[PDB]
Each structure stands twice: as C-alpha cells, then as structure tokens.
Design a protein around this ligand. Structure first.
Ligand code: CL
Ligand code: CL
Ligand code: CL
Lengths: 932, 935
C-alpha cells in the first residue's frame, strides 16, 4: 500500500519551497489526502481509488506545467464513466478540496507571525503575516500620528463595526458539516503538538479518519428559514465566545498604553446584521411569514445562548457583600412564587443576592424563549409579555445593578470576569443576535403608491414627474389624514409589500435594522418607503437606506441625498444619521469593474462632502463583490483604502457567504477578523489615506472612459455575445438548476441587463475565466501607455503609493491567479458552435494581454509575487478544481447533446447526470471562493 | 512590596529538594500565595496582611525545626485577636490551605512518570510515579505469567468495579467552590505553558487573581447543615465535573491498550467494567433526618440528572449521525417513527426527513428523554404526573434497543468507524450510568428490624421475636417466608421508628429497580437479621427485592461471620432467592473502633479468607464491600497496592469500594486524576484476579495472631478500661464541640448517654485527627511490636521480611507511617496545656510517650530512618500542608479555651480592617481539609 509515496511526490512538486519554516501545508494536505484515499478504497473499492488517484495525479501535473495533453487525458477517463461513477468521483474531489481548505485554515491559524518581515508602510496591511494587530495599530497612532491615548480610547468608545451576513449565492453550508470541519481541524492541530503521547496520537488518528468518513458519507432548495438557521451557526461555533475575548484584548492593549479604563461594556464596537429572510429583491420566496419566522427564530437562538451562559454565571456569583440597592432588589425578588435550578439548589437564599437576581433573570429568559417559540409555531401565545424581556434595557438593568454593587464592595475584578463578558455579549448581540435588513426594489413602491393614488382619483404616481412625486409625498408626510384603508385593490405584489410592512409593524424593533431600496435613483424612492412605513402603523420606522446600483445612479446619488437632507421632514426623521448603500458587483455588471471602482471612490467622496454640509453622520454600506469583498489580510488594506472620512467610526460591510467560513470558522481566524476590522476602522478615522494627485484623477477618468467603452462594447454591443454566454458557460444550467435560492433573471425574458450580479459573476467564475472581473483593464492600460510614454511610470507610482489603486490592482491580480485560459478553451471546444469558436479566441487573447499589463503596472514578473502564501494555497486548490472543471465540461456536453454517445466503462463500486453537474458547480464554487 | 522575597525563602526552606525536575510545586504555591496575600491586603488592610504573613512564616519555621517557641508566638498573636480578626485569619488560612491543595493537584496531574524508576516488584504499585498503567499491567500478565491476551480480554469483559459515594463526614464542598477550584487549576497550568504569549499570560494572571478573590468572598457557614437532598446534589457534582465525559475516554484507552497486545475487539459497550452506587439519601443508620421522602427525592433527582445529561449529549449525537445509507431494520424503524406529530430541534431543523434515518431514531429518543426529565421532575415536585409512562424510558432496555439498532445498522454498511465515535461513547455512557447514574443502597440497623418484628409478633400473640433465641428466630422467619398468607395490615401499633422502617420499605417498592442496589444491615450478627430484611421486603410488596448485605462491624461479628453466611447459604429458600451471588460488607472504621487497628486489619484478612472458603463450598459468587477508613481507604497511588494486597480470590472480577468524601476531590476533581483513578482500579482488579499476593508463611500467621492479642489488650485497656479516658477525650479534643456543633450531618453518640462504645466511628476518628495525634490509628501497635521483639530476638527480622514481601503487611504499615507523618505530639501537648486538667496531664503525657514509641517501632519495622522515606513526593506535599494546618491548630485550641472558659480574659488587640463559634467551625473545616484521610 505504497500509494502515499506517490501522492507525496506530486504534492512536493506542486508546492516546492517552504513559504516559512512552520510551513506544514504540504504535510497537512498529504495527511488528509492519505486518510481520505484509504477510506475511499475501503468504501467504494480498490478500482475507484486507483481511478481517482490517477485523475488527481494528472491534475497536479497540469497545474505544474499546463500541458494541454493532460486535459484530454483527464477527459478520456471522465467521459467513459456511467452516471454512478461520475457522481462518486465528483463527490470525492469535492471532499478532497474541502480537506485542502481545512488544512489551509489550520496553517493560517497556527502560522507564526514574523516581526522582521514588516516594511513600515501600508503594504504590510495586505497579509495576515505582516498586518498590524491591535496594539501595533495603537503604537502607530501614538508614535507616528501623535495622537494621545485618551483620543484613541474615546474613538474606540464611539466606534461601531456592523457586520452583515448575506445569503450564500450557492450552498449555504449546513450546521452539521461546520461542526465536522471543526473536529477535523482540531484533530489536525493536536496531531502536530510537539509533545503528544503515542496513545493520544493514535486515538487522534482514529478520530481523524472517523471524521473524514463522517463528512464523506452524508449526501428542497432549503427553505429560507433553513438557510437562515444554517447562516446563524457561526454564533454557536466561534462568535459568541469570540467577542468578549476580543473586547478583553482591547482592554489589555489600552492598559499597555496607559489607559486604565476598559472599553465600556455597553459600547457597540461590534454589531451584527442579517439579510437572511429580509432580502426580497427578485425573490418572491421571501414572504412576510419568512421574515417573521427568521425574526422569532433569531430571538429564540439568542434566548437559548443567554440561558445556557447564565448558569455558570450564577455559580460564580456567590458573594454576600453587596450594595444597599442590590440588597433591596434581592429582598424584593425574594417575594414571589424555582423550577429551573432544582438540580443545583432547592431555592436561592437571600445571603446570595446576586444569585437571587440572576436566577430571576434566568427565569425571564426561559419565558422569553417559550413565548417566541409559541408565536413561531402558532400565531398567539398566553405567556405574559411582562414576564419576559422585550427591550435591551429591561435585560441590561439588573446585570448593570450587579456590576455597580460588586464595584461598590471592592469586588470589581470579579465583575470583570464572567459578568463583564456577559454584559458585552448582551450589548453586542441584543435579544436577536442580528438585526434584519429588509430589501425591496423601488419599482414595487412605485406600484403600491400608484395603486393608492389611482384609488383616490388623483392620478397615477407613476406618470408623475420626480418633482411632482416629491411634492405629493411631502404633502402627505406633513398631513394628519390617513392614506388608505382595507378598501384597496391590491395585486399579489402590492399585497406582499403592504403585508411585509404589517409584519414589521407587529414585531420588536430590536429585530430590524435598515430598509434597503434596490435600484434607488431619486429622493422620491426614500420618501415612498418612509410614507408606506408610517401609514402601515409601524410605530418606530426603520432608517431608510437607498441602494444606488448603476453608474449614472452613483453620479446622481449625492444630489439626491443632499435634496433629502434639505427637506425638513426627512431631516427631522433621520436625526443626524444617514446610511447609504453602494453596490460593487451590481455596478460592475453595469459598467465594468475598473469604472465602478473609480466611480465608487468619487461617489463616496461627494457623499461625504454632502454629509459634512448638512451635519449628518453618514454610514457607507458596502454591498457584495468588489474590492471590499475579500478574505483575511487584504481586507485590512481594503478598509485603509477608502477615501478619507468615509468611515468616521461607523463601518458597515457585507460578509459574503463564500468567505464567511474562512473568516469565522476557527477561533483564531475569527479573533483576527474582528481584530482587523476594528483596527482598520480606528486607524482610518485618525490616519486617512493620501489624497490623490490631480494627474492621478485625470488619468483614472480617461482610463474609466476607455474601460467602460470596451466592457459595454463586448458585453452589450456584440450581437452574438448572449448566445456565446449561453454556450461557453453554465449560466442556463445554474438558473434552471434549483441552486441559487432565488431565481437569476429578474424579468424572465430579459438579457444581461436584467440578469442579477451574482449569476453574472458566477457563470464566468465557474469556467476559471472571470471575464466580468478583468474585462476593460486591458484597453485602459494599453490606451494610457500608448498616449504617453511616461504614464506607465505614473501607473507604477500609483500602485506603490495610492492605497485605493493598490487594492484595485491587487484584486485583479488575485482573480487572474484563479484563472486558466486553457480550461476555458476546453469549454469553448466542447460547448460552443464552430461559427462562434473564433470569438472565444479573441476574448482569451484579451485575457492574456490584460494579465501582462496588470503585471507591468504592479512591477511583478509572476502573479501574486508579493503574497507567496496565498499563491501557495491557491495553487494547492487548483489541482482539485481543474478536475471538477473537466468533469463539468464533459457533463455539460452530455446534458445538452444527447447525440454525443460515449464508450462507457464498467461500473466501479458502491458496496443521473444532473446530480453530477450540481456537484461540479458546488465544488468549483467552493474552490474559487471570492472573485468579484 | 518585597514581602514576596520572604515567603519565597520560607517556602524553599519547607520544601528544599526537587522530587524530580518537573517539580514546580514550590513555584506554584509561591505564586498562588503571593496573589492571595495581595488580595488580602486590598480587601482587609495592610495590618491584616502583615499579621497573616507573620503567622504563616512562624508556622513554616515550626514545621521546619519543631521549635516549641514558634507555637507560643503563634498563640500570642492568635489569642489577642477579637472575634472579627479571628474569623478573617481563620478563613484566610482555610483558603490558603486550599490553594496549597490546588498547586499539589496540578503538580501531581502533570508530573511526568519515570520508567527508569521502577524496581520490578510490587512496591512500585504504591506510588503514581511508578505504578503500572493499563498496558504495563497487560505486559506484566503476558510476560511474567504467560497469560494469553484473550484471557486478559475475557477477564476485562466480566470484571466490574463498583464505586460507592458516601456522605462526606464534614463540609461536602459546594458545587460552586469545586468549579472555582477548577478554574484556578486551569489558570495555573495554562500560565506555565512554555510557549505562551505576553497578552495571554497577562490575561491569565488577571483571571487567576479574579478567581482566587471569587473563592475568598463566598461564605461557607450559614444557612442549614445542608438537607440530605442538598448534600446529595453537591455530591453528584463530580459526574458533571469529570466522570460523565471521563468514562468513555478511559474505555477507549482500554481499547487501545488491548490493541497494543494483539486484541482486535473493543470492550463490549454493554459490559459493566465501571459502575456507580450512592448512599446519599439511603443510609439511615442513626440518622433520622434521612427519611423515606429523602430516599424518594434522591432517587428521582438522580433520574433527572441522568436524563438531563443524555438530553444535552444527544443533540451533538444527532449532528454527528447525518448518514443516509443504513440497515433494512433501521430503515423500517425510520419509516415507522416518521408516522407521528418535533418540538425540540426547531433551532436546528424544522423537521427530520426520512433520508436521515439515524437522525429520526435519535430525535425520537431525544423526545423520550425530555418527557422522562419533565416527568421525574413532576413526580418529585408533586407526587403524581400526567406524562404517560409509555412515553418515557422506564427500564434501561427500552433505551438501549434503538442505539444498538443504530450501531448494528452503521456496522452493516461499513460505517463502523462512524459508529465507534459519538455513538460508541453514548452506548458506553448508557451502560455505565443507566437511567440513574447511581444506584442507591439502603442501610439500617438490624435492631430496627428486631423492633419491627417484635411489634409484629406481640400484635399476633405468639411471643416477642426479641426474646427468642437465634435458632427460634430463624425457625419462625423460615416458616413465614415459605407461606402463602400475608403478615400484617394497617391495624398494627407502630412506633415512630417502626413506621420509619415500614415507610422506607413502601417507598422502595414504589420506585424503579434501576435506582437501587443493596440493602445493608448495620450491626449484623446472625442469619435472622438477614432473613428479617428479606421478609420485610417481601411482605412490604417490594416486587424486585434488593439483595441483602450484612455489615459485620465488631470483631466478634467478624469471627462468627463465615458461620452465619454458611448457614444462610445452606437454607434452600435464601439459596434460590439469591441466585448464586452474595455481597457481604466489612467495616474497617467500625472494627478499629471496637478492637484497635492492627487486630481489625489482620482479622479482616482472615475473615475474607474464610468467606471465600464458604463461597467456594456453596458455589456462590461473593462480593466483598469495603467500608470507610481502613487500609482500603486511601487517596491515589496507594490504593493500587491496597487492592493488590487483598487475600487471593477475594475479588474475582467484582470490586465494591467506598469512595470516601474527604478524598473524592483529590480523585475525581481533575481530568488526569480521574483517568488514573479509574485506571488503577481497573488494572489492580484485573491483576489481583490473575495474580494473587503470596500466601502468608505459617509463622507470619502465628506472629500476627499474637500481635492481635497484645494489641487489642493495650487498645481496649486505654480506651475502655481507663475510667478517666472519657473525661480526657472530652477535654483534649473537640469531640463534644463536633457533636454539639451542627457539623456532622448525623449525630455522634448513638444513644446520647453512652460512652465511646455508642459513639460512632466517624466522630471517633475525626476528634483525634483534628489534634494531629491520631490515637485511634496507631494505638496498640507499640505494645504489639515490643511484645514480639522481646519474646524472640529474631522476630524483628521476621517483621522486616513481611513488610518487604507480604503486600497486606506492607500496606498496613505504609498506612500507619503516613498517618504518623501527619502527626505532631507538640500540638497535642498544646491542647493538653490549654484544655486539660492538671491531674490528668500525666495521662496525656503517657499517651504521647506511646505515640513516640510506636513511631520508632514502625520505623524499625519498615527499615526506615525517617517517615515516608520511600515516598518523598507525599512527604513533600504533606510538609507543605502542615505549615498551614499548624496555625489552624493553635487558633482552634485557644478558641476552644475561650469558648469553654468565659473566666479566661485575654488582652485584646485593636480590630483590623473592613462570634467565636464561626471561628471554631472554620478551624475544624480547614484542618479537616488539610489532613484529609487517616483511618
Ligand atoms: Cl446581488
Ligand atoms: Cl419554521
Ligand atoms: Cl461509619
């Protein structure tokens, strides 16, 4: 059984050097692959294992030298498989790739940092191995920026990082498999403890095989409640315990620069928001009942976690010396009816006052859970609302009383233990863990107000000009008469909108965040949501957040927001705070990526100018994809790259589902995520990036013109482009496939304009081509190099000295690292008409030229020259991904073309090609993670 | 703040050398003591901290050279304290001693073993650093005895270790304080990781200080002398702490060790290698607070604790059990369960689909567990329920069946590795803990049964069962058990005690057999006592009667015991009722209180010999239950040799031992300590079953018989013949204050009037353990060894041969020597000076001289010049503890003088920073926690 020696040789040939000396990635992945292949031999036979290992070896040789002969060598094997063998092989490479990710995570979490590797500039913030931790950021602020420790502390006090969980564009990984990945990571890490005993190591090996098999032997498009349940798992996994540890580390770093206070436990440095069950944009499956469900489910998970956390808190709080105030409350609580701690104590006596009060809190938490459960499964309760906590103050008040009393009695250290962590958990997570944003297209609000005005015999709000719409909406917001009643013809859509508002109205305000308007263009959209909110009797209306998607919408955004701030009603409703959302993926679908990047920098600049004008605190909400959508260290520089004063201590970022596991799956990875978001926000508030030189802005304006020209000329002007897109890519199968929880085309008939951003990026990411990400950069850089000899030098200056530019270029280079034109050529050869075959050749030439020009700008000879660790990990995944690519291509040809008969091979073991296609989609998706 | 330099100096003088090179004990206790003393300065002032530190330094100097001046300097400070400062200093030294204990536990748990330190004989089995682990025991059985691994495996399959939790004789430490100690041990251990980062180390320091303060600021006196339900709750803490998770880890290590000798099977998941029993809520012997309701309560409470733990564990089990390939049998069960109403996993899944059959079955089991928990809670809190009994698990088989279905099903499809994961741990936990975690034994005096039957026969006009001879008692009992007519009804004059007995039986009949073990008869002397319990059981309608276990306490009861047990096996009814299994109990503390220690030890070896002879004669499998104190009563490594020391064939794969409350924290408080405890019980049981100790040479037997005669003569001549002994015991010792003080949950004097004879064994041992004198343990040995050395010059050599080559003798002597390490005649003399009349002073002086003589003689026997010459690790830890205990000794002595004598006015000192009874209780609890086990 000498197969391990060969896979060892191929892994060492794929990743030759050591990116450090704790570089155990090759060792880790070799171990996981040996154990997996032994299990595979045991379950589906020797023949299956030999076939699989032959496929992987060819894949590694290809990712070695990129010989096109290797790809046909893979294909000859993969097409001769009957659907059963195809499914077993595809499943196998999916789990192998997953194991590579798990090993990769262990490497990242236990890679020792290097102090001597820091260069001293902003480039260090692009990798976790050199980025500034919390305290290095403090000493950067104190030494270089001449900020006082008091100023840093006060900034932290008023800072908020708000992380928004969004639905996975594909497989939102089930909670059970998250747990299994956790056990696998734990077993790996412990197996490499330089102190492990022989028996412990054997039992760890046996647990590792056991877990790999457990994950490999498990097989609707999950209901939005199920996907939400799955998306919330990271709170149980790492975030709940991780948050108080991080805040405590903030306290320590403050003590180490002379600050004697701790960060106030009620200061919302960390907040969590969710779109799961709230985003309705082109998703009729997200109903009012779905939103109510995920709201109550969230309140349930929160009550459970607080309930379970408060018993160990009750065990710790056994003191007797206390406040006069606390003693009064304890004697008060002692006057009542003790069912949830009989296993611990028959009853809580009055000489343990903290235990009395805390026991009453535990009882109210129990009634809170049971009521939320009763509302969820029925629609009414009988549990008195006064016997529960309804707002955060009812909850915080007795805990704060305990804290005051303990400090009163010289027991402050005890208070800074389980109690401080608990208080910080209540402040971070509230009664819901997350606050749900609601998202809907503006057009639906136009439809509702149009049915309303037509019903009042005043005309059609839709035909009205923007100014007339604003004037009517303003006259209604300032009036006292209601707008409509039950007597109102509602279409299914109009009734959905109003019913969603009624459900928001009947639920606690702690569950909701922002009302997000998709395709927002004008102030009347924002006023429409505010009016519909008020007239549906929502007592505390949500803050309305416009989403400006298209490029023209971005240009018109600061005028519309200034006009909104200028009207007295909206100015008194917002009370000096406004949140605006900009969409990177969406805008890229409109006008290419380079143009969306520069337009979003300028648009944020102008929005900040308006916000300073009217005295409003602006919060920029960064949607999905983009430069702000990356994993790990790059994000630190991403945040540092935003224009000066666009953050100002209030950051709101989408954590894309395709990165959320790499970011919160493990204890260390999670802690470092929270650390870098907080540190980059704090530093940016006190140390903005440089203002761009005037020639830099002129150069980017021209490049923006050329890049949007090329992008629209290929994507939108070419007549046969849509046919090519439907052939050289699995877009049709992705939409038909019940994969994306929502549908792809907003209007089923329409073109790419109506195609959503997620399938737009996905379709080209599956083929390792990524055209929506890089297209346009080529002609823009060619144009400026040819127009003036010196512009290359200017470009190289920007990449070296302008953070915004460096992060934009860095993203293009990274996406090219995940690209391989040869595989794309295979897709062309199998799936595209001969009439249309030369077209892909031209686009591929553009791919190569764009790659060379990006290298020239970054001063690099190879891709990712500055981040060898990431190059290593990506090169590792590519060996598995390439196999899922070839399998997906031939499977597509077999699905579309029943006239393509293959010489099948005999069944292998196990002692429908649609399923295999879905496997390859999920696999390739999991191996490429984030692109644009 | 250079105070740290002084406490470091004193600590290094107390423990000078290194018992290894991972000896960080002095570092550990120095760090903890520094942090504690800083907290003490911050809360109660600088003067309080300086006074306390001056006291501790003097205490350590005393435990160094035993200079009598140091004791008067301690007393001089301690008498001048007004009651407030007395409370603060006593509390302070209690928590400091606890920290010495915690540092000691960390040192023991992380001390690396040394393979080169093994000598190759049985002496190695007396210390954790050299004892044989499971695999070393296997290879010792295979190499030296040429046993096949299959024989070892079959022995393990049929071996059972049965550990019985009994009430702590004093402060059964509250669950909360156990948890704080856990956090402190973890901060220490993590603070010394040789790779730890600066911020982590700073935050661990902050957590350590925080936790030490948390423990110091909780009261440990007020409320009630905890109700038996509360004491049971506190006693059950070790299942949540370590035992629940600990059982499957140990069994898996057993599997690995079996693999390393060629055995490919695992220990069958239903095989009872480990069992737990409880007396908490069942022992009524001289304890009227333990009522029938108490028994019903602890049974149902235990059933709740078990259902809770299974409920929480089966959710992770449900996450692991996500397979789809399954058995035809399991697939059928999944389709059936799917036909029903799904309320306990909405946060996880809306409902369980049929393509996850293991999740279907496990979810339905989880539902049944929730109904069981809430139902038992309803029975406890009311008296009835409404939860249908068919919607719960009433016996262990309903519970085990679907889990075995999952295991069989998983193995059918080549998923055996998956089954040997979360599921195997679960099956072994169900088999070990059952539906109750523990089985409650009931214990009652035989005399109470005599009272019940006497009221019965008097009510029927046949005579008084009490006046009847033993043979007539037997004849009547035998005529009644074989008959078809009931014995009594409601029309029966019952005294309060008789009603207690009958209600106890009625409660036993109304509860599941899964909750009960053995009915143990205290002061058992004759077969009529056992037949009385069997009859009262049958006539009180207990459907599945408990197995009856006589407790032979007094020496004469032990001598007559094999005759009585033989007579019991010879009666056809009892023979067919017991079905070939019998458990008999012997009591080490009881026998020592009767006849001294040496005679009770030798008498118990012979008594076990004779009981085995009877069991082999009649073909019955005998189980010896070892009560509290004794040679079988120690902490840690010594138990390994203790078990190996029992007479051949007395164990035979079924061991039942009392785990005394004063040691249970040292044995089950920490992960490693727990694993090694289970390991040494299992390994010692297996080895004794296959490799008995040598049989004693005839001259060793004759010699021990002589020593038994002389030793009982001295012991009874001092305890029972000296008239003023009872007078002295009430002065030189806090026996009176222990009983009057609401300390021992039960009372001391059985009949309040009587002497030591009616005094229970626990207060008897305790009273003398507090004064560092330990008279009940060593008295009689002095004269015995003197007698045999004088009769023949050569007997010393014979004694020295026995200690070196006879395990029983070595463990007995080892125990006496260990108790002597914890003894100090100077402190006992201080108690004499403060509390004892002058005309009785020579009496104590004479007793102390016996103390000295026995000590020297014990040394001569063990071939040692210093105490504990062969176990420096134990000597080291004991020396460490004694420096703290001594201050609590002097304080307790002067506090006793202040309580008894209000005519003793002291020149008080001013109060320091922000009731002598509470002080006394503090000193008792502290000294008890530092001295732990003796005899
Ligand atoms: Cl989107
Ligand atoms: Cl639901
Ligand atoms: Cl006893």
């Amino acid at each position: 059984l000498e197969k391990m020696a060969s896979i060892d040789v191929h892994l060492r040939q794929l990743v030759p050097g050591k990116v450090s000396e704790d570089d155990k990635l090759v060792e880790y992945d070799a171990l996981l692959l040996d154990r997996f292949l032994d299990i595979l031999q045991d379950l589906h036979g020797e023949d299956l294992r030999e076939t699989v290992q032959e496929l992987y070896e060819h894949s590694a040789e290809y990712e070695g030298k990129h010989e096109p002969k290797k790809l046909e060598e893979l294909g000859s094997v993969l097409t001769s498989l009957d659907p059963g063998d195809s499914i077993v092989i595809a499943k196998a490479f999916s789990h192998m790739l997953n194991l590579a990710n798990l090993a990769e995570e262990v490497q990242i979490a236990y890679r020792r940092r290097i102090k001597k590797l820091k260069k001293g500039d902003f480039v260090d913030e692009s990798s976790a191995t050199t980025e500034s931790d919390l305290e290095e950021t403090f000493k950067k602020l104190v030494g270089d920026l001449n900020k006082s420790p008091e100023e840093i502390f006060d900034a932290l006090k008023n800072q908020t990082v708000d992380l928004v969980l969004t639905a996975h564009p594909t497989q939102s990984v089930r909670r059970s498999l998250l747990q299994k990945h956790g056990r696998i990571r734990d077993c790996l890490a412990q197996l490499y403890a330089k102190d492990i005993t022989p028996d412990d190591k054997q039992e760890l090996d046996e647990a590792l095989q056991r877990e790999i098999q457990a994950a490999f032997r498990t097989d609707t498009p999950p209901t939005p409640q199920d996907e939400m349940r799955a998306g919330m798992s990271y709170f149980h996994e790492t975030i709940w315990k991780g948050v108080p540890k991080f805040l405590r580390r903030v306290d320590t770093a403050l003590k180490n620069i002379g600050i004697e206070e701790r960060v106030p436990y009620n200061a919302p440095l960390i907040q969590f928001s969710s779109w799961m069950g709230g985003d309705r944009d082109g998703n009729p499956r997200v109903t009012p009942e779905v939103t109510r469900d995920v709201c109550l489910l969230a309140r349930m998970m929160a009550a459970t976690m607080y309930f379970n956390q408060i018993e160990d808190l009750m065990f710790e709080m056994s003191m007797w010396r206390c406040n006069d105030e606390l003693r009064a409350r304890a004697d008060e609580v002692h006057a009542n009816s003790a069912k949830h701690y009989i296993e611990f104590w028959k009853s809580i006596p009055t000489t343990e006052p903290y235990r009395v009060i805390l026991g009453d809190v535990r009882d109210k938490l129990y009634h809170t859970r049971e009521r939320a459960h009763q509302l969820l499964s029925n629609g009414h309760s009988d549990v008195p609302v006064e016997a529960t906590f309804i707002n955060l103050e009812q909850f915080l008040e007795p805990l704060e009383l305990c804290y005051r009393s303990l400090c009163s009695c010289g027991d402050r250290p005890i208070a800074d233990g389980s109690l401080l962590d608990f208080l910080r958990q209540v402040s971070t997570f509230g009664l819901s863990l997350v606050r749900l944003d609601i998202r809907q297209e503006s057009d639906r609000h136009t439809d509702v107000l149009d049915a309303i005005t037509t019903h009042l015999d005043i005309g059609s709000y839709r035909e009205w000009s923007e100014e007339r719409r604003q004037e009517w909406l303003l006259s209604e917001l300032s009036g006292k008469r209601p707008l409509f009643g039950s007597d109102l013809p509602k279409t299914e859509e109009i009734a959905d909108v109003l019913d969603t508002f009624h459900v928001i109205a009947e639920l606690p305000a702690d569950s909701f965040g922002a009302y997000i308007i998709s395709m927002a263009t004008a102030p009347s959209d924002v006023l429409a949501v505010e009016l519909l909110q008020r007239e549906c009797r929502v007592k505390q209306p949500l803050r309305v957040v416009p989403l400006f998607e298209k490029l023209a919408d971005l240009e018109a955004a600061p005028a519309a927001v200034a006009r909104l701030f200028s009207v007295d009603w909206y100015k008194n409703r917002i009370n000096g705070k406004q949140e605006v959302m900009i969409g990177y993926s969406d805008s890229g679908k409109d006008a290419g990526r380079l143009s969306a990047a520069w337009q979003l920098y300028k648009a944020q600049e102008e929005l900040v100018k308006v916000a300073k004008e009217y005295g409003v605190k602006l919060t920029m909400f960064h949607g999905r994809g983009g430069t702000v959508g990356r994993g790990g260290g790059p994000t630190h520089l991403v945040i540092l790259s935003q224009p000066p004063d666009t953050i100002n201590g209030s950051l709101r970022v989408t954590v894309q589902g395709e990165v959320i596991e790499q970011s919160f799956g493990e204890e260390h990875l999670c802690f470092r995520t929270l650390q870098r978001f907080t540190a980059a926000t704090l530093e940016h508030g006190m140390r903005p990036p440089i203002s761009p030189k005037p020639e830099w802005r002129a150069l980017l304006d021209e490049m923006a013109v050329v890049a949007t020209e090329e992008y629209r000329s290929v994507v939108f002007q070419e007549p046969r482009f849509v046919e090519y897109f439907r052939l050289a890519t699995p877009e049709l199968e992705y939409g038909r496939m019940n994969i994306g929880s929502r549908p792809s085309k907003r209007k089923p008939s329409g073109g790419i304009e109506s195609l959503r951003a997620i399938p737009w990026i996905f379709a080209w990411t599956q083929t390792r081509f990524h055209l929506p990400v890089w297209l346009g950069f080529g002609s823009a850089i060619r144009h400026v190099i040819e127009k003036d000899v010196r512009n290359l030098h200017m470009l190289q200056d920007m990449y070296q000295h302008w953070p915004f530019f460096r992060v934009t270029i860095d993203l293009i280079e990274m996406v090219f690292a995940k690209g391989d034109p040869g595989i794309a050529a295979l897709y062309d050869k199998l799936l595209v008409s001969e009439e249309l075959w030369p077209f892909g050749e031209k686009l591929r030439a553009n791919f190569e030229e764009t790659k060379k020009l990006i290298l020239q700008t970054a001063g690099h000879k190879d891709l990712l020259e500055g981040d060898p660790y990431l190059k290593q990990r990506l090169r590792l995944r590519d060996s598995y991904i390439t196999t899922l690519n070839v399998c997906q291509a031939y499977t597509l040809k077999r699905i579309r073309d029943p006239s393509y008969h293959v010489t099948l091979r005999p069944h292998i073991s196990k002692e429908g090609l649609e399923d295999t296609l879905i496997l390859t989609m999920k696999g390739i998706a999991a191996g490429l993670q984030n692109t644009g």
